[PDB]
Amino acid sequence: EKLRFIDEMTTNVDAVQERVLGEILGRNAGTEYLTKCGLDGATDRAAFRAKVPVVSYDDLQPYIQRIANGDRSPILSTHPVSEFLTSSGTSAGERKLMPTIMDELDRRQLLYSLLMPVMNLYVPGLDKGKGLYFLFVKSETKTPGGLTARPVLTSYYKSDHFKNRPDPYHNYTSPTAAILCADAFQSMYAQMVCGLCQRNDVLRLGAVFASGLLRAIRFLQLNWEQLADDIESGELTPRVTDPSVREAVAAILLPDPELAKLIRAECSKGDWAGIITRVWPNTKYLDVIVTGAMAQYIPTLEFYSGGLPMACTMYASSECYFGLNLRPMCDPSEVSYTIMPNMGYFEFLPVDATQLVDLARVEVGREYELVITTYAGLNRYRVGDVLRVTGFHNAAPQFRFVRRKNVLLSIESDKTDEAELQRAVERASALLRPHGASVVEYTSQACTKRIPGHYVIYWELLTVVDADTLGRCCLEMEEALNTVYRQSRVADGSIGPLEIRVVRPGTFEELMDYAISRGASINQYKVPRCVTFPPIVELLDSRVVSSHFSPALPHWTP
Ligand SMILES: Nc1ncnc2c1ncn2[C@@H]1O[C@H](COP(=O)(O)O)[C@@H](O)[C@H]1O
């Protein structure tokens, strides 16, 4: 029983953790990295705790670049590297490369196998229908040494764990051919058409991130005309060039006019509230992450779903799959993730290795940074995630996701940190300085009033700059932002043009006075992003003199 496995693992947290670390060290304690730490082959917890330092990405990057450039000696593991999983987190504007090994796919597959067993406890009958999940592959590259680098889900979807899988609780409408198609449009359109045809078997709707599902809905808003047509005519549109997709959908696309009729009846109305249960009326819930930065999207999802529950099922990363939500139907505000003690060796830094707290021993109410040791040879690596213990499941702590440290803005997988944002502001002022203008202060917000959302930067200038020049400032900020952002702009369409709102002189002084109604004066520092979803965003907006948008896409190529 998957459920009994969860109960055993969480009952025996600290014993499992010891055994896992023994397995990892049995595998790796003889690698270059651990030998350099002086472990000298020890596989026991006391030796490890004593000798292995806590590290960040930049401490490991020298080892990673050696592997990327073709070093195939056992640097990090006696299981050598199979590919690089590209985190959406960056350093110097480039994606961090998380080495993985072939063995880890099986542990990822184990975590996935736990999800529907838990869900089935709260939502009956899912086996009697399909899931409409919009899933997408993104671009791959190769390192100078020949290894592939690509996102974990892209790796997942192109793996046979996924392609040739044995299961009624995983009956999906999307043909893997459409999932694997490069082009966002063809992939989206083809998956929409298959979701609509099968509209009535659809018991749940989803995508990895809430924003992905929102972009699927916007896609419908823009293409239901041709969609209703191909449904009626039963003929695949020739916008779809990709021959492998055409063959997958045309394999289930049946001519159906009673179907096409309704699609027009619901999408012709200008009102799209509850559109999801109107097109897919047996939908029981939405399977999308809406914790952390995706929380922004909850109101928008509710409007389109008509109030359907939103399941946040899993907590995972490019470097390590962590665990799962044992209460997937709770309220989004109530989500906590139970880290699974078999997935790696997990330690916690209260927000140096002597302060590390073991998984079993974290304290309810406290916030910690996640520090992980993995089979792939990450050793006391800091993920950057801040977590708050909300309680315990048997001996296993449960965590509310707080944030990834230093991340200011995300629309999707982009994770723009304060350093990149500040440098972006500095690069755009080359357009301002000839006017005699400079940016006295700025802040930002992720704006999701439309799909896709976009970055809004507030500028208080000191000197007038014309509107075309300020729009070019938007573009320049985008050129300076990281590869994930620009890729999302040019390739995915998941982020719309960046917006600069110029605020009147004295605006940030006011922003100070409003927070001071609370905050400590000689403790205040201007927030570089604002989320207090009404009061502070409303105050800034109320001081805006003009608004400007990037008139063109930034540069990006894989
Ligand atoms: N429910 C969630 N599941 C996975 N990642 C999350 C969640 N909420 C926030 N995140 C962030 O997403 C990161 C994974 O980034 P990546 O390695 O690009 O997949 C995590 O380390 C978290 O900071």
PDB file of all heavy atoms in Angstrom, residues 25-50:
ATOM      1  N   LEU A  25      26.084   8.064   1.394  1.00  0.00           N
ATOM      2  CA  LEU A  25      27.506   8.050   1.699  1.00  0.00           C
ATOM      3  C   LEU A  25      28.172   6.748   1.259  1.00  0.00           C
ATOM      4  O   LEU A  25      29.318   6.761   0.805  1.00  0.00           O
ATOM      5  CB  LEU A  25      27.704   8.280   3.191  1.00  0.00           C
ATOM      6  CG  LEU A  25      27.277   9.674   3.645  1.00  0.00           C
ATOM      7  CD1 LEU A  25      27.714   9.869   5.064  1.00  0.00           C
ATOM      8  CD2 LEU A  25      27.891  10.733   2.740  1.00  0.00           C
ATOM      9  N   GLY A  26      27.480   5.620   1.377  1.00  0.00           N
ATOM     10  CA  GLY A  26      28.006   4.397   0.785  1.00  0.00           C
ATOM     11  C   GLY A  26      28.325   4.579  -0.686  1.00  0.00           C
ATOM     12  O   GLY A  26      29.342   4.084  -1.180  1.00  0.00           O
ATOM     13  N   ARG A  27      27.478   5.335  -1.393  1.00  0.00           N
ATOM     14  CA  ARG A  27      27.657   5.597  -2.817  1.00  0.00           C
ATOM     15  C   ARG A  27      28.738   6.624  -3.099  1.00  0.00           C
ATOM     16  O   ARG A  27      29.479   6.491  -4.083  1.00  0.00           O
ATOM     17  CB  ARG A  27      26.365   6.133  -3.413  1.00  0.00           C
ATOM     18  CG  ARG A  27      25.450   5.096  -3.926  1.00  0.00           C
ATOM     19  CD  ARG A  27      24.376   5.807  -4.684  1.00  0.00           C
ATOM     20  NE  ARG A  27      23.149   5.065  -4.636  1.00  0.00           N
ATOM     21  CZ  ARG A  27      22.108   5.369  -5.378  1.00  0.00           C
ATOM     22  NH1 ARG A  27      22.175   6.411  -6.205  1.00  0.00           N
ATOM     23  NH2 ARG A  27      21.014   4.639  -5.288  1.00  0.00           N
ATOM     24  N   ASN A  28      28.788   7.697  -2.302  1.00  0.00           N
ATOM     25  CA  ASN A  28      29.538   8.883  -2.678  1.00  0.00           C
ATOM     26  C   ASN A  28      30.694   9.244  -1.758  1.00  0.00           C
ATOM     27  O   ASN A  28      31.559  10.012  -2.178  1.00  0.00           O
ATOM     28  CB  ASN A  28      28.599  10.095  -2.759  1.00  0.00           C
ATOM     29  CG  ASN A  28      27.483   9.890  -3.744  1.00  0.00           C
ATOM     30  OD1 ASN A  28      27.582   9.058  -4.655  1.00  0.00           O
ATOM     31  ND2 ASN A  28      26.403  10.648  -3.576  1.00  0.00           N
ATOM     32  N   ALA A  29      30.729   8.735  -0.521  1.00  0.00           N
ATOM     33  CA  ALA A  29      31.741   9.160   0.445  1.00  0.00           C
ATOM     34  C   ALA A  29      33.162   9.032  -0.092  1.00  0.00           C
ATOM     35  O   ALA A  29      34.074   9.647   0.471  1.00  0.00           O
ATOM     36  CB  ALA A  29      31.601   8.358   1.751  1.00  0.00           C
ATOM     37  N   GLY A  30      33.375   8.231  -1.141  1.00  0.00           N
ATOM     38  CA  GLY A  30      34.643   8.086  -1.829  1.00  0.00           C
ATOM     39  C   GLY A  30      34.846   8.979  -3.048  1.00  0.00           C
ATOM     40  O   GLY A  30      35.918   8.937  -3.661  1.00  0.00           O
ATOM     41  N   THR A  31      33.849   9.784  -3.421  1.00  0.00           N
ATOM     42  CA  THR A  31      33.969  10.741  -4.521  1.00  0.00           C
ATOM     43  C   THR A  31      34.995  11.834  -4.188  1.00  0.00           C
ATOM     44  O   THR A  31      35.432  11.986  -3.044  1.00  0.00           O
ATOM     45  CB  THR A  31      32.618  11.393  -4.803  1.00  0.00           C
ATOM     46  OG1 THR A  31      32.193  12.077  -3.618  1.00  0.00           O
ATOM     47  CG2 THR A  31      31.580  10.361  -5.166  1.00  0.00           C
ATOM     48  N   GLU A  32      35.348  12.634  -5.202  1.00  0.00           N
ATOM     49  CA  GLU A  32      36.308  13.722  -4.993  1.00  0.00           C
ATOM     50  C   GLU A  32      35.800  14.712  -3.950  1.00  0.00           C
ATOM     51  O   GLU A  32      36.531  15.093  -3.029  1.00  0.00           O
ATOM     52  CB  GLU A  32      36.611  14.444  -6.319  1.00  0.00           C
ATOM     53  CG  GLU A  32      37.634  15.599  -6.213  1.00  0.00           C
ATOM     54  CD  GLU A  32      37.796  16.413  -7.511  1.00  0.00           C
ATOM     55  OE1 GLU A  32      37.835  15.820  -8.615  1.00  0.00           O
ATOM     56  OE2 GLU A  32      37.883  17.661  -7.426  1.00  0.00           O
ATOM     57  N   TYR A  33      34.541  15.133  -4.074  1.00  0.00           N
ATOM     58  CA  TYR A  33      34.036  16.196  -3.214  1.00  0.00           C
ATOM     59  C   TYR A  33      34.075  15.792  -1.743  1.00  0.00           C
ATOM     60  O   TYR A  33      34.617  16.518  -0.898  1.00  0.00           O
ATOM     61  CB  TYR A  33      32.615  16.576  -3.635  1.00  0.00           C
ATOM     62  CG  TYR A  33      32.097  17.736  -2.828  1.00  0.00           C
ATOM     63  CD1 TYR A  33      32.332  19.049  -3.236  1.00  0.00           C
ATOM     64  CD2 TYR A  33      31.416  17.522  -1.627  1.00  0.00           C
ATOM     65  CE1 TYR A  33      31.892  20.116  -2.483  1.00  0.00           C
ATOM     66  CE2 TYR A  33      30.966  18.576  -0.874  1.00  0.00           C
ATOM     67  CZ  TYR A  33      31.206  19.875  -1.310  1.00  0.00           C
ATOM     68  OH  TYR A  33      30.766  20.922  -0.554  1.00  0.00           O
ATOM     69  N   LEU A  34      33.507  14.628  -1.414  1.00  0.00           N
ATOM     70  CA  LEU A  34      33.527  14.163  -0.028  1.00  0.00           C
ATOM     71  C   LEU A  34      34.937  13.790   0.447  1.00  0.00           C
ATOM     72  O   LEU A  34      35.261  13.976   1.626  1.00  0.00           O
ATOM     73  CB  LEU A  34      32.566  12.985   0.131  1.00  0.00           C
ATOM     74  CG  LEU A  34      31.094  13.427   0.076  1.00  0.00           C
ATOM     75  CD1 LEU A  34      30.122  12.261   0.152  1.00  0.00           C
ATOM     76  CD2 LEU A  34      30.775  14.477   1.161  1.00  0.00           C
ATOM     77  N   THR A  35      35.783  13.249  -0.422  1.00  0.00           N
ATOM     78  CA  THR A  35      37.165  13.033  -0.006  1.00  0.00           C
ATOM     79  C   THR A  35      37.818  14.352   0.382  1.00  0.00           C
ATOM     80  O   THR A  35      38.543  14.422   1.386  1.00  0.00           O
ATOM     81  CB  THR A  35      37.964  12.355  -1.110  1.00  0.00           C
ATOM     82  OG1 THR A  35      37.372  11.091  -1.409  1.00  0.00           O
ATOM     83  CG2 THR A  35      39.430  12.151  -0.662  1.00  0.00           C
ATOM     84  N   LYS A  36      37.540  15.419  -0.383  1.00  0.00           N
ATOM     85  CA  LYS A  36      38.098  16.736  -0.066  1.00  0.00           C
ATOM     86  C   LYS A  36      37.598  17.258   1.275  1.00  0.00           C
ATOM     87  O   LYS A  36      38.289  18.050   1.930  1.00  0.00           O
ATOM     88  CB  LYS A  36      37.772  17.729  -1.183  1.00  0.00           C
ATOM     89  CG  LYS A  36      38.501  17.398  -2.501  1.00  0.00           C
ATOM     90  CD  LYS A  36      38.469  18.530  -3.533  1.00  0.00           C
ATOM     91  CE  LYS A  36      39.468  18.240  -4.666  1.00  0.00           C
ATOM     92  NZ  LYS A  36      39.372  19.185  -5.826  1.00  0.00           N
ATOM     93  N   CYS A  37      36.399  16.851   1.692  1.00  0.00           N
ATOM     94  CA  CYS A  37      35.902  17.205   3.015  1.00  0.00           C
ATOM     95  C   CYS A  37      36.530  16.381   4.134  1.00  0.00           C
ATOM     96  O   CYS A  37      36.242  16.646   5.303  1.00  0.00           O
ATOM     97  CB  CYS A  37      34.383  17.049   3.075  1.00  0.00           C
ATOM     98  SG  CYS A  37      33.496  17.999   1.844  1.00  0.00           S
ATOM     99  N   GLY A  38      37.361  15.394   3.818  1.00  0.00           N
ATOM    100  CA  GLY A  38      37.992  14.607   4.860  1.00  0.00           C
ATOM    101  C   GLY A  38      37.135  13.491   5.407  1.00  0.00           C
ATOM    102  O   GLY A  38      37.514  12.866   6.398  1.00  0.00           O
ATOM    103  N   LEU A  39      35.981  13.234   4.795  1.00  0.00           N
ATOM    104  CA  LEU A  39      35.134  12.133   5.234  1.00  0.00           C
ATOM    105  C   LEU A  39      35.878  10.813   5.182  1.00  0.00           C
ATOM    106  O   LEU A  39      35.656   9.937   6.030  1.00  0.00           O
ATOM    107  CB  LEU A  39      33.882  12.065   4.360  1.00  0.00           C
ATOM    108  CG  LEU A  39      32.698  11.319   4.968  1.00  0.00           C
ATOM    109  CD1 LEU A  39      32.487  11.771   6.390  1.00  0.00           C
ATOM    110  CD2 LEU A  39      31.464  11.565   4.118  1.00  0.00           C
ATOM    111  N   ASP A  40      36.741  10.652   4.182  1.00  0.00           N
ATOM    112  CA  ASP A  40      37.544   9.454   3.960  1.00  0.00           C
ATOM    113  C   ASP A  40      36.739   8.178   4.188  1.00  0.00           C
ATOM    114  O   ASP A  40      37.077   7.327   5.011  1.00  0.00           O
ATOM    115  CB  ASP A  40      38.791   9.455   4.825  1.00  0.00           C
ATOM    116  CG  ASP A  40      39.676   8.251   4.551  1.00  0.00           C
ATOM    117  OD1 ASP A  40      40.126   8.086   3.390  1.00  0.00           O
ATOM    118  OD2 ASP A  40      39.894   7.449   5.489  1.00  0.00           O
ATOM    119  N   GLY A  41      35.665   8.049   3.416  1.00  0.00           N
ATOM    120  CA  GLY A  41      34.945   6.799   3.311  1.00  0.00           C
ATOM    121  C   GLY A  41      33.924   6.532   4.395  1.00  0.00           C
ATOM    122  O   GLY A  41      33.130   5.584   4.253  1.00  0.00           O
ATOM    123  N   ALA A  42      33.904   7.327   5.465  1.00  0.00           N
ATOM    124  CA  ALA A  42      32.917   7.125   6.518  1.00  0.00           C
ATOM    125  C   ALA A  42      31.507   7.263   5.957  1.00  0.00           C
ATOM    126  O   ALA A  42      31.236   8.115   5.105  1.00  0.00           O
ATOM    127  CB  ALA A  42      33.136   8.124   7.651  1.00  0.00           C
ATOM    128  N   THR A  43      30.609   6.404   6.430  1.00  0.00           N
ATOM    129  CA  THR A  43      29.208   6.418   6.016  1.00  0.00           C
ATOM    130  C   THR A  43      28.272   6.717   7.192  1.00  0.00           C
ATOM    131  O   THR A  43      27.045   6.662   7.035  1.00  0.00           O
ATOM    132  CB  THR A  43      28.842   5.081   5.354  1.00  0.00           C
ATOM    133  OG1 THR A  43      28.909   4.024   6.330  1.00  0.00           O
ATOM    134  CG2 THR A  43      29.810   4.765   4.192  1.00  0.00           C
ATOM    135  N   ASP A  44      28.813   7.056   8.357  1.00  0.00           N
ATOM    136  CA  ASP A  44      28.007   7.248   9.551  1.00  0.00           C
ATOM    137  C   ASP A  44      27.683   8.720   9.779  1.00  0.00           C
ATOM    138  O   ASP A  44      28.436   9.627   9.393  1.00  0.00           O
ATOM    139  CB  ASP A  44      28.719   6.693  10.781  1.00  0.00           C
ATOM    140  CG  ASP A  44      29.986   7.438  11.076  1.00  0.00           C
ATOM    141  OD1 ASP A  44      31.009   7.184  10.402  1.00  0.00           O
ATOM    142  OD2 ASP A  44      29.945   8.305  11.966  1.00  0.00           O
ATOM    143  N   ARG A  45      26.557   8.938  10.455  1.00  0.00           N
ATOM    144  CA  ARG A  45      26.014  10.279  10.612  1.00  0.00           C
ATOM    145  C   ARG A  45      26.988  11.208  11.333  1.00  0.00           C
ATOM    146  O   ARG A  45      27.168  12.368  10.934  1.00  0.00           O
ATOM    147  CB  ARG A  45      24.690  10.181  11.362  1.00  0.00           C
ATOM    148  CG  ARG A  45      23.835  11.399  11.271  1.00  0.00           C
ATOM    149  CD  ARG A  45      22.662  11.248  12.193  1.00  0.00           C
ATOM    150  NE  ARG A  45      21.431  11.745  11.599  1.00  0.00           N
ATOM    151  CZ  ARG A  45      20.220  11.340  11.953  1.00  0.00           C
ATOM    152  NH1 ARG A  45      20.071  10.422  12.914  1.00  0.00           N
ATOM    153  NH2 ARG A  45      19.156  11.867  11.360  1.00  0.00           N
ATOM    154  N   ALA A  46      27.621  10.729  12.407  1.00  0.00           N
ATOM    155  CA  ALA A  46      28.491  11.599  13.197  1.00  0.00           C
ATOM    156  C   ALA A  46      29.668  12.102  12.366  1.00  0.00           C
ATOM    157  O   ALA A  46      30.028  13.284  12.434  1.00  0.00           O
ATOM    158  CB  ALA A  46      28.985  10.863  14.447  1.00  0.00           C
ATOM    159  N   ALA A  47      30.288  11.209  11.582  1.00  0.00           N
ATOM    160  CA  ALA A  47      31.364  11.621  10.683  1.00  0.00           C
ATOM    161  C   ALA A  47      30.882  12.694   9.711  1.00  0.00           C
ATOM    162  O   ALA A  47      31.530  13.729   9.529  1.00  0.00           O
ATOM    163  CB  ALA A  47      31.891  10.409   9.916  1.00  0.00           C
ATOM    164  N   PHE A  48      29.741  12.446   9.067  1.00  0.00           N
ATOM    165  CA  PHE A  48      29.185  13.390   8.106  1.00  0.00           C
ATOM    166  C   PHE A  48      28.947  14.753   8.741  1.00  0.00           C
ATOM    167  O   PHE A  48      29.410  15.789   8.242  1.00  0.00           O
ATOM    168  CB  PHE A  48      27.877  12.829   7.572  1.00  0.00           C
ATOM    169  CG  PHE A  48      27.205  13.718   6.580  1.00  0.00           C
ATOM    170  CD1 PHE A  48      27.611  13.702   5.257  1.00  0.00           C
ATOM    171  CD2 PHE A  48      26.148  14.537   6.958  1.00  0.00           C
ATOM    172  CE1 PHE A  48      26.992  14.507   4.310  1.00  0.00           C
ATOM    173  CE2 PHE A  48      25.503  15.352   6.006  1.00  0.00           C
ATOM    174  CZ  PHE A  48      25.940  15.332   4.684  1.00  0.00           C
ATOM    175  N   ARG A  49      28.189  14.768   9.837  1.00  0.00           N
ATOM    176  CA  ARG A  49      27.843  16.019  10.495  1.00  0.00           C
ATOM    177  C   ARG A  49      29.089  16.822  10.826  1.00  0.00           C
ATOM    178  O   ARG A  49      29.108  18.051  10.666  1.00  0.00           O
ATOM    179  CB  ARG A  49      27.023  15.724  11.748  1.00  0.00           C
ATOM    180  CG  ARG A  49      25.575  15.460  11.424  1.00  0.00           C
ATOM    181  CD  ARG A  49      24.693  15.760  12.591  1.00  0.00           C
ATOM    182  NE  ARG A  49      24.779  14.703  13.578  1.00  0.00           N
ATOM    183  CZ  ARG A  49      23.742  13.972  13.981  1.00  0.00           C
ATOM    184  NH1 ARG A  49      22.531  14.190  13.484  1.00  0.00           N
ATOM    185  NH2 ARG A  49      23.920  13.026  14.889  1.00  0.00           N
ATOM    186  N   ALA A  50      30.156  16.126  11.231  1.00  0.00           N
ATOM    187  CA  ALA A  50      31.388  16.773  11.657  1.00  0.00           C
ATOM    188  C   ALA A  50      32.179  17.347  10.485  1.00  0.00           C
ATOM    189  O   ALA A  50      32.823  18.390  10.626  1.00  0.00           O
ATOM    190  CB  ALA A  50      32.256  15.773  12.426  1.00  0.00           C
TER     191      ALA A  50
END
